[PDB]
Amino acid sequence: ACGLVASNLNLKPGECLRVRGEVAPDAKSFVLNLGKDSNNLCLHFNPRFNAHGDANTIVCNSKDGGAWGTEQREAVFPFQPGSVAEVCITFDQANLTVKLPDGYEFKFPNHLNLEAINYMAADGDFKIKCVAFD
Amino acid sequence: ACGLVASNLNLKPGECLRVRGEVAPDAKSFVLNLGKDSNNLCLHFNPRFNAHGDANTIVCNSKDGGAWGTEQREAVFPFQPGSVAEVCITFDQANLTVKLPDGYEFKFPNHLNLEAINYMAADGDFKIKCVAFD
Numbered sequence: 001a002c003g004l005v006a007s008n009l010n011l012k013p014g015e016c017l018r019v020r021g022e023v024a025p026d027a028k029s030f031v032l033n034l035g036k037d038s039n040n041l042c043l044h045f046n047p048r049f050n051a052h053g054d055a056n057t058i059v060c061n062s063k064d065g066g067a068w069g070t071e072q073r074e075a076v077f078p079f080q081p082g083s084v085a086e087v088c089i090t091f092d093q094a095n096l097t098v099k100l101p102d103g104y105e106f107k108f109p110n111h112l113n114l115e116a117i118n119y120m121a122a123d124g125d126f127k128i129k130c131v132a133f134d
Numbered sequence: 135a136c137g138l139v140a141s142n143l144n145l146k147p148g149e150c151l152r153v154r155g156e157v158a159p160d161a162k163s164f165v166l167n168l169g170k171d172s173n174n175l176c177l178h179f180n181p182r183f184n185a186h187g188d189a190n191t192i193v194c195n196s197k198d199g200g201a202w203g204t205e206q207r208e209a210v211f212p213f214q215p216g217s218v219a220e221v222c223i224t225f226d227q228a229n230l231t232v233k234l235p236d237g238y239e240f241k242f243p244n245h246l247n248l249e250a251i252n253y254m255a256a257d258g259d260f261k262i263k264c265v266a267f268d
Contacts, residue, residue: 003142004143
């Protein structure tokens, strides 16, 4: 029961990927994967409301050659179940910059040093309503 | 490989799929494919500015199990090279409807009778900049 999957995004550095979606009223978690393909993700965005013992916490990671990297969590959680949310993503050689709903912003190291983001896959309790490329 | 490819769209009857893109300045033609998957297309939207023996003419067709159906040709050609084009697509038991802001709208028989559009692909001189679902 997965969601949107888009390839050939060809998102270059500095370019902004904007994703707007509807967070389910009883959402437990949702995921946005970005990278080259399903085995090579420069970013695994997985805001968790309550799903893996975790409660209202944003979990980030990367996957290189099928291998998950060292997980990373953010303190803030600007996501409300039953509400519409937008996340804006960009990157450079050193970091991916993720801009969340209430202005909050954070960087995730660009572990794969990807030339461009060509793959995106959404999953979970987040119904994509709009996706804008640069 | 080509332009943006998106799957798992899960567009249902009546729901509007809006696509905004940039037509290349040297646009010879561009394609918007909609269907179940790459081999099952309820709509192959192909405006041809100057491709094949065609000039400034829209060609539409379907694809069933990999086999192309019979093409349909339009007289109206509301497209221009090096410009932003916007299309609004929907469907029902009878036809697929492609609308433009100018007021132009094309109808193509729903040959496959699919009850959902899960696949969308862009090819040619059309770069997708935004896609909105329902």
